Amino acid sequence: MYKTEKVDLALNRNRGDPITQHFGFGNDEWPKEWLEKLDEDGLPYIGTYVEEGDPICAYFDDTLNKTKIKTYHSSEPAYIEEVNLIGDESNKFQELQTVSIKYRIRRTPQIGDKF
Amino acid sequence: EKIKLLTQATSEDGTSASFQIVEEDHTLGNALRYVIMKNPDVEFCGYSIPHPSENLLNIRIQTYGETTAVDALQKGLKDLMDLCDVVESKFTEKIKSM
Amino acid sequence: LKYICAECSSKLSLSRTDAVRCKDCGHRILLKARTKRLVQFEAR
Amino acid sequence: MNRQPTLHKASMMGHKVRVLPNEKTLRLHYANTGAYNADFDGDEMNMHF
Amino acid sequence: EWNVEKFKKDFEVNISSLDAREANFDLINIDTSIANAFRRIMISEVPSVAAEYVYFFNNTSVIQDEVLAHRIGLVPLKVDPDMLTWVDSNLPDDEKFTDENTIVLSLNVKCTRNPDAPKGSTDPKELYNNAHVYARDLKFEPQGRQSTTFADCPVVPADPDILLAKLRPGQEISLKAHCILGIGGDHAKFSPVSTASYRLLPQINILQPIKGESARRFQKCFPPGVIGIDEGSDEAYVKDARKDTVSREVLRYEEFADKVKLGRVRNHFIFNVESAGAMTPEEIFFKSVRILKNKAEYLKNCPI
Amino acid sequence: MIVPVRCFSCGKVVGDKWESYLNLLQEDELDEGTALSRLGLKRYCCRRMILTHVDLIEKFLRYNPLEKR
Amino acid sequence: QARTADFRTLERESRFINPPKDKSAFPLLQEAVQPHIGSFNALTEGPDG
RNA sequence: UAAAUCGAGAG
Ligand SMILES: [Zn+2]
Ligand SMILES: [Zn+2]
């Protein structure tokens, strides 16, 4: 089963106000445990096993100057299949803000599956 | 603790008893049950799996007297071992002739 | 290099604050590359 | 144990629980089929504790 | 007064053929229970070697890594199970694998396009280099002290022509595989047998003589190697029932409705055992009976 | 997608008879049954594992994101 | 035997490896979406603009 | 964290 969730950090700004959230690990202090899945760009390593509650992206925020990480909101543990760093077609060098993460989950036939 | 005696199914003197063995299935149960039913002192013998998912096997041995059902189980196991020995020897000796 | 253009397949990289764009062609979609890391499995 | 719709009172009975070790589905004996008017082509039902 | 000596007196082993990939023999004058026990222990309880833990370092192929690792696990290994001990799941995974119980395989295959591919040809062999990943690519990497004992026997798959995956230029597959010893009831990949099954010897009873052209028709209702004809009177007889699958096509005819009866012998088992490749079928059978004897002995030694 | 390593029912390894079956159907003019038999597939369980395979991975391999189209 | 279909192998695997360059095989599949394509292509093109 | 409306389904 392939499932795609779109992680977006541009949800909380408009009218050209500055980007307050930057993908990646900031200069503050964070526990290194988050390095299991996230890359130095705050993106999941492709093909990693993602449980529930494990981080799937890290964004250093200007509003608080503390590194905040998003989690996986699902029950079935998944594998990070692919990532699309969607860019915006604007003349400005607008930073990366929209990401499309697609995961695969192994649906081995369990008892109770309709055939 | 591979095999246990079910005190709630047995008899006082031992002339009838039930055994529960882990990690076994029809494969050992049927062989042992046939072999022990070949013993003349045993009245009622049978095998039962509580639930297929569980790896448990109960063997019911009710003798006719004169020998405790524990000993009947031991003799059945011995005769199973001897049967395996003879089939091994026969197959080995006949594989060389070919 | 950790990214790949979704159009011309040419590998590329991204700087901090830098625009999300393929250098060699007009594309702004960048797949994340797969790097060398341990991933375990079980053949079941 | 109840199985919607509850067309009659006998469709919401009380069973004794056996803790099976293996799979994620409510395993139920055949006799109660007419009692719940159930099948096993994906019928869903609820257990209240 | 059934006794082991009496069984030994009646029991005997006949063989039809032999091979390293298929043994067809007979066990005669033995109870259905023991034939079933041998069949089942052969299918399930014989230890074998197959890929268990598949560590991945990179997989850019089109196959999702779980399916690839499962294919590797399904790959039979031409290694005798007897050479290595068993694993201890309760110990830490750091020291769970040792040189005595874990066999380490690798696979580092990267696809690169071949410039010398002739123009106007669609063959993936000429176009690409290392396009197809095969089982022979599963290079064996001995570890620890097993560089000596495995030198005589190279750990190679029983089938090196198994097509694991298909690559394309740019893509690559690199992995290691700890393969260990396990029984086929745990998982079918650990099974050592393609199929090990018996059948009751067919028995044909020609109740009445069917002499004449009818016998010609009656012979046609069975495979070639079973029914023959007498010389003087054209009367049919059974030659070798082992060459008759039970089709029951004779009963389809009203003419021979009450002239033949078909059944099975009570204790005449024809075993056909096809090995996976790690061991000979005969060694499979012997290991099965030996494990049954050991099982009964261990059970006997259990203090109830 | 790609040829299964083993036949599901029995367990016989049919993970190597795919290209051979294609060759015996293509290099030599053979019917499907003749090719399956000449590879050692008499049980219909093993025969259906190679007879009806589609080998979809070829169509999956065109869409390579690591090579300029 | 008369009701003889055939696995079009060596015709299907070949078409898998190298897709057609001339016209899509299975014309019946294109006509399945005639109501949509043939209708959207009726608002711009055709007679009267 | 919601709640509605439209659509798709399971029994
Ligand atoms: Zn590009
Ligand atoms: Zn098969």
From Swiss-Prot, chain A:
Q: What else is known?
A: Three distinct zinc-containing RNA polymerases are found in eukaryotic nuclei: polymerase I for the ribosomal RNA precursor, polymerase II for the mRNA precursor, and polymerase III for 5S and tRNA genes.
According to the UniProt record, which cysteines are disulfide-bonded?
A: none
Q: Where in the cell is it found?
A: Nucleus, Nucleolus
Query: Which family is it part of?
Result: Belongs to the RNA polymerase beta chain family.
Signal peptide position in this chain?
none
- Please report the name of this protein according to its UniProt entry: DNA-directed RNA polymerase I subunit RPA135
Q: Which domain of life is it from?
A: Eukaryota
Function comment: DNA-dependent RNA polymerases catalyze the transcription of DNA into RNA using the four ribonucleoside triphosphates as substrates. Component of RNA polymerase I (Pol I) which synthesizes ribosomal RNA precursors. Besides, RNA polymerase I has intrinsic RNA cleavage activity. RPA190 and RPA135 both contribute to the polymerase catalytic activity and together form the Pol I active center. In addition, subunit RPA12 contributes a catalytic zinc ribbon that is required for RNA cleavage by Pol I.
| Coiled-coil region | none
Swiss-Prot record, chain C:
Q: What keywords were assigned to this record?
A: DNA-directed RNA polymerase, Metal-binding, Nucleus, Peroxisome, Ribosome biogenesis, Transcription, Zinc, Zinc-finger
GO cellular component terms, alphabetically, are:
cytoplasm; nucleolus; nucleoplasm; nucleus; peroxisome; RNA polymerase I complex; RNA polymerase II, core complex; RNA polymerase III complex
Q: How is it modified after translation?
A: The N-terminus is blocked.
List locations, semicolon-separated: Nucleus, Nucleolus; Peroxisome
Q: Does Membrane appear among the keywords?
A: no
A biological process (GO) annotation for this entry? transcription by RNA polymerase III
Give the boundaries of each C4-type zinc finger: 5-25
Molecular function (GO) terms for this protein are: DNA binding; DNA-directed RNA polymerase activity; zinc ion binding
List of residues binding Zn(2+): 5, 8, 22, 25
Outline what the protein does.
DNA-dependent RNA polymerases catalyze the transcription of DNA into RNA using the four ribonucleoside triphosphates as substrates. Common component of RNA polymerases I, II and III which synthesize ribosomal RNA precursors, mRNA precursors and many functional non-coding RNAs, and a small RNAs, such as 5S rRNA and tRNAs, respectively. RNA polymerases are composed of mobile elements that move relative to each other. In Pol II, the core element with the central large cleft comprises RPB3, RBP10, RPB11, RPB12 and regions of RPB1 and RPB2 forming the active center.
The extra comment attached to this record reads: Present with 907 molecules/cell in log phase SD medium.
- Family that this chain belongs to: Belongs to the archaeal Rpo12/eukaryotic RPC10 RNA polymerase subunit family.
What is the protein name given in its UniProt record? DNA-directed RNA polymerases I, II, and III subunit RPABC4
Taxonomic classification: Eukaryota, Fungi, Dikarya, Ascomycota, Saccharomycotina
Swiss-Prot record, chain D:
Name of the protein described by the UniProt record? DNA-directed RNA polymerase I subunit RPA190
What this chain does, per the entry, is described as:
DNA-dependent RNA polymerases catalyze the transcription of DNA into RNA using the four ribonucleoside triphosphates as substrates. Component of RNA polymerase I (Pol I) which synthesizes ribosomal RNA precursors. Besides, RNA polymerase I has intrinsic RNA cleavage activity. RPA190 and RPA135 both contribute to the polymerase catalytic activity and together form the Pol I active center. In addition, subunit RPA12 contributes a catalytic zinc ribbon that is required for RNA cleavage by Pol I.
Q: How does it assemble?
A: Component of the RNA polymerase I (Pol I) complex consisting of 14 subunits: RPA135, RPA190, RPC40, RPA14, RPB5, RPO26, RPA43, RPB8, RPA12, RPB10, RPC19, RPC10, RPA49 and RPA34. The complex is composed of a horseshoe-shaped core containing ten subunits (RPA135, RPA190, RPB5, RPO26, RPB8, RPB10, RPC10, RPA12, RPC19 and RPC40) where RPA135 and RPA190 form the DNA-binding cleft. Outside of the core, RPA14 and RPA43 form the stalk that mediates interactions with transcription initiation factors and newly synthesized RNA.
Gene name of this polypeptide: RPA190
- Where in the full protein does the shown chain start and end, and how long is the full protein? 589 to 637 of 1664
Query: What is the organism of origin for this protein?
Result: Saccharomyces cerevisiae (strain ATCC 204508 / S288c)
Q: What else is known?
A: Present with 2840 molecules/cell in log phase SD medium.
Residues the entry annotates as binding Mg(2+): 39, 41, 43
Q: Where in the cell is it found?
A: Nucleus, Nucleolus
Curated annotation (Swiss-Prot), chain F:
Task: For this UniProt record, give its keywords in alphabetical order, as a comma-separated list.
Answer: DNA-directed RNA polymerase, Isopeptide bond, Metal-binding, Nucleus, Ribosome biogenesis, Transcription, Ubl conjugation, Zinc
Which GO-annotated molecular functions does the record name? Answer: DNA binding; DNA-directed RNA polymerase activity; zinc ion binding
Q: Where are the transmembrane segments?
A: none
- Name the PROSITE patterns for this protein: RNA_POL_N_8KD
Q: What does the UniProt entry say about where the protein is found?
A: Nucleus, Nucleolus
The residues that the entry says bind Zn(2+) are 7, 10, 45-46
Cross-link Glycyl lysine isopeptide (Lys-Gly) (interchain with G-Cter in ubiquitin), residue numbers? Answer: 59
A GO cellular component entry from the record: nucleus
Q: Which InterPro entries match?
A: RNA_pol_su_RPB10, RNA_pol_suN_Zn-BS, RPABC5/Rpb10
Q: Give any single GO term for biological process.
A: nucleolar large rRNA transcription by RNA polymerase I
Per the record, the similarity remark reads: Belongs to the archaeal Rpo10/eukaryotic RPB10 RNA polymerase subunit family.
Function recorded in the entry: DNA-dependent RNA polymerases catalyze the transcription of DNA into RNA using the four ribonucleoside triphosphates as substrates. Common component of RNA polymerases I, II and III which synthesize ribosomal RNA precursors, mRNA precursors and many functional non-coding RNAs, and a small RNAs, such as 5S rRNA and tRNAs, respectively. Pol II is the central component of the basal RNA polymerase II transcription machinery. Pols are composed of mobile elements that move relative to each other. In Pol II, RBP10 is part of the core element with the central large cleft.
Stored HAMAP family: RNApol_arch_Rpo10 (MF_00250)
**What extra comment accompanies this record?**
Present with 5300 molecules/cell in log phase SD medium.
What is the name of the protein in this document? DNA-directed RNA polymerases I, II, and III subunit RPABC5
Q: What is the lineage of its organism?
A: Eukaryota, Fungi, Dikarya, Ascomycota, Saccharomycotina
